[PDB]
Amino acid sequence: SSSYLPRAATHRNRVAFQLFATPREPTASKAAAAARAAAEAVARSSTVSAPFTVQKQQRLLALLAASDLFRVHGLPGFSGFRPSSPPHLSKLFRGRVSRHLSCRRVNHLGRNNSGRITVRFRGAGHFRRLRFVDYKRGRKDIFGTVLRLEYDPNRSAHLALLQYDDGVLSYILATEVTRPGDRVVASKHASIAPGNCLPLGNIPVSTIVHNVELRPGAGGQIVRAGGCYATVVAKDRHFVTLKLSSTEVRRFPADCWATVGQVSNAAHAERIRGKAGVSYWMGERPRTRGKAMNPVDHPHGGGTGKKGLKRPPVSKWGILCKGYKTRAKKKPLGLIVRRKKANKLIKKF
Amino acid sequence: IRPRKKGMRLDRRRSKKQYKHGRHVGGWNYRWLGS
């Protein structure tokens, strides 16, 4: 939404910089020398250069899996309620998100500036905070330590609290293999390890990446949801081809940055709610069927007793919604190499 | 009238409509003091 920072701060089509520098040296020449030294140090430390594939991810996950005093004494808690795990054993932090890196979420409740409902079936849900996650990874050639992993109510993936070597705190998207104590860096000289951020031109083919920039320096926009990932297919001097989670093959400028690995929380899809109340907490409202209404209220409505659709499926607004394409025909494909087809055709061919 | 509409409406005396009618105690053709 636009209820956060104003347009003048949020909107910028062409970003003129890709390195958010924070020099320590007194002069520009010494700052440049220090930046070169830091890049050389990152290059020296970098040793891994082979692609990071699905199989290597599985091997790392297998290795990670293979590898009474701590309580509040005298504190009888609730009669029945108890946390699923104590703080020193839970996968997630179990604490509270940093106040300095978040703010209260403005809940629009599916209504636009006109006050009318534009997004249907939205409910209040549980109170939420928006947290400021660094989609840019602007700080380059500085190593950071993952201190903890955190839940995010607006996002399907997990977040990670990164403490840079100078004490700066930030939140980044966590990878499926990201654990506390991990060391991460953003640079073109970085090794090919999960969590590291590199330009798409410095990532070998077959590697798995996430948080891909459409425009250099504008922050990753593609492949963000939990468990999602994209694969590097081909590379040329100016463009790198990626296969996306939707089975879409698209080219990206070689200068667009990306992070190695799969998005954390790949088990999101396995969640079972069990009752309407869980979705109610999550922020959903009941969905009344089109054919349950009167003919004035939906094209499928009307008819004594129950009936069928009586016509090819259409939405409330009279548009075919089963097989009818909606992308603008005249809109150019641009860098899109090939866009996916229907899932039935994909699975039958 | 509720706050949202009040925030966009303007006061009656911000225009000249008040002086374009002749309504008065004697009828609809008021002759102002001093003619």
């Binding site: 209820s3 104003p6 500036n113 006109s114 | 706050p3 949202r4 925030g7 966009m8």
Partner: peptide, 23 residues
């Protein structure tokens, strides 16, 4: 909730109210 949310002046940047100490 916010009757004036959509107005052009809503949450405007600057102004004499917030710029008291600015020279």
């Amino acid at each position: 909730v916010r009757p004036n949310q959509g107005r052009n002046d809503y949450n405007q940047v600057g102004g004499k109210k917030r710029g008291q100490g600015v020279q």
